[PDB]
Amino acid sequence: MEAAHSKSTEECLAYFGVSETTGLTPDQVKRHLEKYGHNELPAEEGKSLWELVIEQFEDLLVRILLLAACISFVLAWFEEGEETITAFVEPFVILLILIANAIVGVWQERNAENAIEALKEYEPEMGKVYRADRKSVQRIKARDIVPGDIVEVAVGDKVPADIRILSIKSTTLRVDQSILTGESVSVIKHTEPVPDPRAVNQDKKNMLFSGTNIAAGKALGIVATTGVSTEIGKIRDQMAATEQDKTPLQQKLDEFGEQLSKVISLICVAVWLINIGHFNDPVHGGSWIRGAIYYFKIAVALAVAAIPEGLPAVITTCLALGTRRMAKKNAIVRSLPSVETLGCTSVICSDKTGTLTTNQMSVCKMFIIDKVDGDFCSLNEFSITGSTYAPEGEVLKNDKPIRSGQFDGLVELATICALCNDSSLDFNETKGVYEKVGEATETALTTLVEKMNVFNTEVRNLSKVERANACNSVIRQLMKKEFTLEFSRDRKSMSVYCSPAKSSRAAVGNKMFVKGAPEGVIDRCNYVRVGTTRVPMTGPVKEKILSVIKEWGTGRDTLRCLALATRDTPPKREEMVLDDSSRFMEYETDLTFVGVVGMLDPPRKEVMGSIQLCRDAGIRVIMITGDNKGTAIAICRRIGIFGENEEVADRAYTGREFDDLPLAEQREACRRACCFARVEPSHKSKIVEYLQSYDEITAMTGDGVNDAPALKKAEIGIAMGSGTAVAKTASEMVLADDNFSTIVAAVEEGRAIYNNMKQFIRYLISSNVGEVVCIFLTAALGLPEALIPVQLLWVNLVTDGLPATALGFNPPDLDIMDRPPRSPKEPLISGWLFFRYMAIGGYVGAATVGAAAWWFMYAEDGPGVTYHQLTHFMQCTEDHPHFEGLDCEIFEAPEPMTMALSVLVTIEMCNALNSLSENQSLMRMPPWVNIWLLGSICLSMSLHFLILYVDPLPMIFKLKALDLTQWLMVLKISLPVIGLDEILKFIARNYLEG
Amino acid sequence: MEAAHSKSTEECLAYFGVSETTGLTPDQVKRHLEKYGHNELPAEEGKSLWELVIEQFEDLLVRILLLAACISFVLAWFEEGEETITAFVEPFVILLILIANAIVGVWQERNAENAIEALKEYEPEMGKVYRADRKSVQRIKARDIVPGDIVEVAVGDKVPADIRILSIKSTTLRVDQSILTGESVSVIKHTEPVPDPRAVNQDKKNMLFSGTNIAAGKALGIVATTGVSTEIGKIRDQMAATEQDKTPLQQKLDEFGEQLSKVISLICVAVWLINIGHFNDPVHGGSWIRGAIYYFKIAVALAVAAIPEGLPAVITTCLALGTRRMAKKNAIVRSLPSVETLGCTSVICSDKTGTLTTNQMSVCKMFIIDKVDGDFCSLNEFSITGSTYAPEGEVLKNDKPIRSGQFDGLVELATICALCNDSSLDFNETKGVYEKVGEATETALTTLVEKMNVFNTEVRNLSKVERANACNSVIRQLMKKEFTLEFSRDRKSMSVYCSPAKSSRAAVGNKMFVKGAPEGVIDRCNYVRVGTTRVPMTGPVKEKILSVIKEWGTGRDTLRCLALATRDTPPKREEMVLDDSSRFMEYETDLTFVGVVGMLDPPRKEVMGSIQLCRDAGIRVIMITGDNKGTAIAICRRIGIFGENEEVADRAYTGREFDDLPLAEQREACRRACCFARVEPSHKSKIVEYLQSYDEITAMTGDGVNDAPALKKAEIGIAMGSGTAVAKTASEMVLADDNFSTIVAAVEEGRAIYNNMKQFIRYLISSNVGEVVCIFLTAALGLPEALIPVQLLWVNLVTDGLPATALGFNPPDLDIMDRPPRSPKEPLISGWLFFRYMAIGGYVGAATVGAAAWWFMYAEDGPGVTYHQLTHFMQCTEDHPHFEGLDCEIFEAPEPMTMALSVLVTIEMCNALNSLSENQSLMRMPPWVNIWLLGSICLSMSLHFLILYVDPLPMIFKLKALDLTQWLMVLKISLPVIGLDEILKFIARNYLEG
Numbered sequence A, B: 001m002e003a004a005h006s007k008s009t010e011e012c013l014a015y016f017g018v019s020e021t022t023g024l025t026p027d028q029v030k031r032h033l034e035k036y037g038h039n040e041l042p043a044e045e046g047k048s049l050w051e052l053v054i055e056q057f058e059d060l061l062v063r064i065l066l067l068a069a070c071i072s073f074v075l076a077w078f079e080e081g082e083e084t085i086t087a088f089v090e091p092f093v094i095l096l097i098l099i100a101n102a103i104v105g106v107w108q109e110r111n112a113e114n115a116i117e118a119l120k121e122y123e124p125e126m127g128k129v130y131r132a133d134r135k136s137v138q139r140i141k142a143r144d145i146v147p148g149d150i151v152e153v154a155v156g157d158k159v160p161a162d163i164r165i166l167s168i169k170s171t172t173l174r175v176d177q178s179i180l181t182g183e184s185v186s187v188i189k190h191t192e193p194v195p196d197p198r199a200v201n202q203d204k205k206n207m208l209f210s211g212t213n214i215a216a217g218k219a220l221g222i223v224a225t226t227g228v229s230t231e232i233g234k235i236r237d238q239m240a241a242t243e244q245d246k247t248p249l250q251q252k253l254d255e256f257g258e259q260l261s262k263v264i265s266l267i268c269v270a271v272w273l274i275n276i277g278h279f280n281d282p283v284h285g286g287s288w289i290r291g292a293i294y295y296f297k298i299a300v301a302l303a304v305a306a307i308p309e310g311l312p313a314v315i316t317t318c319l320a321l322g323t324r325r326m327a328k329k330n331a332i333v334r335s336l337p338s339v340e341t342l343g344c345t346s347v348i349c350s351d352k353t354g355t356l357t358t359n360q361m362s363v364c365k366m367f368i369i370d371k372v373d374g375d376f377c378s379l380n381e382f383s384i385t386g387s388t389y390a391p392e393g394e395v396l397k398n399d400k401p402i403r404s405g406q407f408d409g410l411v412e413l414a415t416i417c418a419l420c421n422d423s424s425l426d427f428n429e430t431k432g433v434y435e436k437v438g439e440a441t442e443t444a445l446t447t448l449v450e451k452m453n454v455f456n457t458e459v460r461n462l463s464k465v466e467r468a469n470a471c472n473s474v475i476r477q478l479m480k481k482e483f484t485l486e487f488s489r490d491r492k493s494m495s496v497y498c499s500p501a502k503s504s505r506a507a508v509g510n511k512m513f514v515k516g517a518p519e520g521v522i523d524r525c526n527y528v529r530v531g532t533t534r535v536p537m538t539g540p541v542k543e544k545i546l547s548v549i550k551e552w553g554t555g556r557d558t559l560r561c562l563a564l565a566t567r568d569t570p571p572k573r574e575e576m577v578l579d580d581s582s583r584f585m586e587y588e589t590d591l592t593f594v595g596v597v598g599m600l601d602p603p604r605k606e607v608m609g610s611i612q613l614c615r616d617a618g619i620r621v622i623m624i625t626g627d628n629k630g631t632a633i634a635i636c637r638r639i640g641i642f643g644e645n646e647e648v649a650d651r652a653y654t655g656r657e658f659d660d661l662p663l664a665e666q667r668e669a670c671r672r673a674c675c676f677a678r679v680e681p682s683h684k685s686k687i688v689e690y691l692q693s694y695d696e697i698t699a700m701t702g703d704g705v706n707d708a709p710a711l712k713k714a715e716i717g718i719a720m721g722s723g724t725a726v727a728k729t730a731s732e733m734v735l736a737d738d739n740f741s742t743i744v745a746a747v748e749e750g751r752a753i754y755n756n757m758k759q760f761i762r763y764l765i766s767s768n769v770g771e772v773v774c775i776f777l778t779a780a781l782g783l784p785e786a787l788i789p790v791q792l793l794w795v796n797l798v799t800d801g802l803p804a805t806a807l808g809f810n811p812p813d814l815d816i817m818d819r820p821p822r823s824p825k826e827p828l829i830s831g832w833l834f835f836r837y838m839a840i841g842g843y844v845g846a847a848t849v850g851a852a853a854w855w856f857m858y859a860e861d862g863p864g865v866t867y868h869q870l871t872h873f874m875q876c877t878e879d880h881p882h883f884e885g886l887d888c889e890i891f892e893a894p895e896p897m898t899m900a901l902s903v904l905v906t907i908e909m910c911n912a913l914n915s916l917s918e919n920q921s922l923m924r925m926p927p928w929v930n931i932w933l934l935g936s937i938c939l940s941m942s943l944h945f946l947i948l949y950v951d952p953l954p955m956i957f958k959l960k961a962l963d964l965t966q967w968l969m970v971l972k973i974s975l976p977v978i979g980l981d982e983i984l985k986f987i988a989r990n991y992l993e994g
């Protein structure tokens, strides 16, 4: 291990003490191996099937049911008679649900893949190393390589480790450092050293990163680090370090069971304290074991009554559907629960190139020099039409087309653009459109010459595919390209050496075509070319050039400026060291300015207003781009992120300036800034770190492994469709269209989804509330239990289930994006709403009881035990308070239960209608606003009857009831709930809220 | 209410003023009801669950612990630090034991049924009465009947109240007055009056007792009394009046807590007076609150140290087991504690018929007249073999078989036996033995004819079941039985009127076959039959008959003599009033003697020696039988209750003679008598009354509600297995085999049980004694407490528990029944034994202290604070007497405690071996005499270690100790106890005792 892109090749072979010619001795291998370790990432997936199923039994709720399944299970074991076997239905049911539960929890973790699991898929299986114990090339296992030994790589190979390059045996070494960033554009490596000890991998031009591919050539070097010590390994560690918090819903939803559990235990203590008879009057007698079961018989019906089971199933059917929905919107949410956290989006950090813009580079402006004198200089502004890369378009001055060949400076300008370019074009067949081969920014430079056509080459004679590089091939003949000094973030410029085509052996006639950022390049020109003539360089002409760069850079028409110069009298060919990237800038000196060109990265059509929406939605958007702070701001002003004329001094920083500030001022700027330019590496994480210290649900974008740590810390990391897999597997969403708008699009749908959920979640635990009350009266008024766990179950699982599901389909409330984001703190049930369900609950919990106690007392036709004093007993052990009779077990009648049970069903089907909106009467909120609701309602009802007359079913649940004035009681005992509701529903006018 | 079996039917309707035809007017009902009351027994079971649990908190011991659970509970509330919550174990433990205690005390009273509760189960739910407000038969509630109104009863009915019969509408009225006595033999009722105003229910032949059943017919009468005024009600009152004293153990065991409590309060006062420092030296300072806890910290460990809790659990495991034991001996003890009072049995009162004897009646002798002359008369002695009822046997004179048909007198003798009998025979299938149908004494008379066979009827042609009544059916043809004058205790005889079978209408030829006790019958014969001839009756032949009755009655071969005569010329058929039982004797006059028969009630095989045992065991046995004093004594002489030739004049009384004596002479005779004949009704109680005035633990036997008051007053009332339920539920034991011996059998086992108990009870409070001493030194020598309540608990509950339990299994000491009964006064601990445990206690109470004080001072490896002067302080508030140091809390080390705790355990495991016998060295009393002891001992030890190394446990109790010369101290500090013991154990030789 040795982070050394700064140490020289010698200093490195030194540190490790090795021989580039022999290698590490079989001994040093053992020594180093045991010192450092196996070169591989800790493989971990210790999620055993056993432990797995168990993990699905830690949630208090599912636990409460368990203990509730025991009692039940044992209560069906303690009964006399031959029908004591028909008592095992209830328990088997419960446990079955507890099982089907675990099943599902285990069938997700099977396919539930993580990103860290992906990295391992980036490090190769085998590698070529040269050990001193031999001579040939032995290809050991990539897992067995160690820092220190010498390795070899060639085309197609996947770099096995962090490798400092010693010698590049091919003519040039090239690599696909894509997995790191995404820019497929291979890069050129070198052997010379890099001074800055703390330099970005991007500037480590003599290192080979593990996971990378040898695009071109073959070289050998010395392994500096391995395992989780390598660039990738570091990231994998950072990712394995991030603590991913639980969805706010999940949190809220969790505390609920925490409380529900508590309450339940309170009802139990209360109950006992209510009926403290035997503990104060009953003598020995014998009703001591019976008076026991009853107390336990009601606990199980105390759990299934409180536990809103079946809800999870609903929240899921809902999410899934919501998910498949967004899918059609080019938005792919991976984590089902995220569809919720999404809609709470406080802030959004999106990348410019490719999300905010289309990334369809295009040269539209370009000025050359016209003439210079005693401070009197003139330029030669231009314009070119052509959004696409196709040669479709024409150059024009003063909005009037001119012929390029008519201007000298434009022919040379066109030279460079062509000979200093490294990209090609091609006409697609299937698509029949012009496609780009190579760097965007280059292909455009190509397209420029393909238009200008400074040489009038017949193209109307060549097909669409043929003239793909017409005016280019022609200029490729005028000059024979010797070599090229690749662009470097260093001198931020690029060149290319080449000579004529009718030459022999003779010193003179060699050209160097430089292409770079105005600043540097221009700062290296000593001469200005005026067509064919060339004259020196002065303050006048210079500023007259720069300024315009600014016009074009910060002006309304946001453009990328690229300076073009040419070295007329370059150094003797046999005097250039084409291996010292450092020497390139010096070679590219004493230049001759030839022109400038402005490009454009068109802001996506849709982003235009999508930004606006976020302002309406109070969702902030911070743009992260590689553009200079200067043009960066301008681009923002152009997409609306900034006010065309507002001060943004303290609202836009550059990666550099950012680090300059102390963690105090650092965290501040994050709540205000909206534009980061030339953002450093570990910055999306720094930004997400802070945007979180202010409890803002953040959205981050970007791809590449060196971009996964941030997509994991954000509340909703976002990856492009075309992005890398690590990114995708490491993200909440995957913009298929890579189009920013798609984010806003989804964010909204999230808001809509959590709204309709928030309803059915209330509609559901509401029935539970009432249910409990019911089970609580029957416990105080010793009445036969009106409801049994079995029924209650079918209820919260089916009867209520459907309306719950339909209640998700509630039409999306408008004025959805005109409000700030939902605070994660915002509870589902509070204040008035609390008291409201508090009532709706008490009502049903009471109505249900008396809906059966009526079948006993005021009963029209039945055991009319009018004021029999059921509250007093169910003893009948005496049978004396009842003068004459030979039957008392009537108490356990199925008519009264089915009465209450039908009452519950009636109430809920209605209460499911009082849910289509929180505080709106049904007269403004017609039940037919949500047809799916009225629909399910019917399937819910015919189901109720389906379990009352269909011979089998009415056996296990309860007996049926006749239309014979039976149901009418039901209705006249239920419907009023709507009134209670509606009353309390729009009783909010008298409290100023809506 | 009106006790009137003496008033006539008129006089009765008079007293109450009612009309047998109309009845009581709806008014008189109210009037009488409010005068007398509801006809029912006061229902009482006011044992509320609340009060119940409370009743289980009045015992000083359990109370002391309570106050001891408070301090503890509050001491764990007054502590600083985060581990102040680990202090709630101790209290929770205590209270838990106090709770589990109450639990058990309540789970017994639930099923703990009483006899009085049974009586209520004898009075019917409804009854038929004729009120003057109607005509038909209205069946009101048996609870609503009142003295005065007319009732009706018929077959199957259960007599609702005390009813004087007015008219018997059926041909004859019969009743099952079983619940009163047990003799299932129904009785015949009448309407005529009974003169004697104070006559036994048995002679109240015109009354119907509540709880009784109408065996045959249907009659009506007038209710004379109800409620607790009826025969049954009286008894229920007597039973509810008896004060049942607490078992002698319970008494002794009670005074102990009474004293233990006292002592404890003395140790406290002493302690304070011991360390009176702060009250004489300490200035203000601040160790005033610490010096407080300590004083309270040792009180709780002063209670749990003294209170031998866990003992009750032992005395129970012991008793239960002892109980299930006797169970296999046909002895069923109902009250667990009785297994103790049993073994102290001073005297035993057993019933002859069925307990002392087998009650398998059998005629073995029978003499008829041979010839008479001038004072010259000869008889005709006989013999018949046949223990069982089966016809298996043959009549024989001079030991040589003769044919019955050859003697005239024997054919007639056989007539009566058959026609004057009212019982049948039958051959059982399952058992394949001859069973008896009817009165024992009759079936035998039947079996007699089934043998004699005076008519040579072929029976070897009929099955076993067929000839069941052969020679009988034959004689049942010779004479047609008209009617029968049922036996009455009055003329102590019975008859039967019948005529020939080839008759018309003609005065002459009617016979009356009389069957009774020699005395009366013979005294009514004017003629003697000599075969076919008949001659008068004279002094000679008469005495020649009587005498032999005496021979056979008092002679060695104890027999029941029954005289047989026949009235030749009875009164004209149409001249007998078959309704005036009084007129029967006169009808049965001018008789003709026909023969005599001797029976035998075989003394149970086992009783033979069982009586002897009691003499060895100094247990007196008094026989209560219905035999005449004459044959009674003889029977006693035969079973050994009496010396074959000793004077028993003042050692045997008849129910009559008994009452004749004044309460002065009455109570006397009870300590001397051993045989009561013709015992009156309220006499078993009178006898138990007296046998108790001499502090004799009495055993009484017998069954029937009219026999429960006595079974409740006796120290151990005894009921037969076949007895009535009131009796059983009203008794201490239930002889399943009804065989007297079973009593002696059990009585012995009781002695064995209280012996082994007496040991473990001593072994247990012994550890307590020592324990306290320990807790008393630590209090004087201010040493850190060597022992904590927590440990001490595990001790007296487990470590000591097991050996206690095994110590119950100590093999039964021989010479068990050769000693008089244990005096109830005899204390468990006194004299030398006191001083002995006084020492064994002081030793352990000291050894334990120094077993920890050693870990401090002389400590080999540890806080070797050699003579540190711990007695001086545990202050360290100064930390100056200890020059250099930064730690003092070492004091609260777990090593020293576990040291003492292990010391205790070692000592007790040994002291549990010094218990297998009071004054016997282990060299004569090997520890392997009681394997269960050596066994538990191991489980006791491995348990000790189990709470020292098993991670969890060693946490709450204390730390462990290494074999590394640690335990050796333990052993070398414990074992010597055995020496101390053994020394003091057999130091009794020098004091003449063993």
Ligand SMILES: C/C=C(/C)C(=O)O[C@H]1C(C)=C2[C@H]([C@@H]1OC(=O)CCCCCCC)[C@@](C)(OC(C)=O)C[C@H](OC(=O)CCC)[C@@]1(O)[C@H]2OC(=O)[C@@]1(C)O
Binding pocket: A252, A253, A255, A256, A259, A260, A261, A263, A264, A267, A305, A306, A307, A308, A761, A765, A766, A768, A769, A770, A772, A773, A776, A827, A828, A829, A834, A835, A837, A838, A841
């Ligand atoms: C499932 C059924 C029941 C009855 C339950 O225990 O709900 C309580 C409870 C735990 C809360 C309450 C319920 O409180 C009561 O009903 C008070 C006791 C009365 C019952 C006695 C019988 C007469 C919720 C259910 O109901 C009402 C109507 O007030 C609403 C809400 O729940 C939510 O927002 C959770 C939604 C996911 C919570 O106040 C919640 O406490 C919280 O912390 C929240 C914020 O969770």
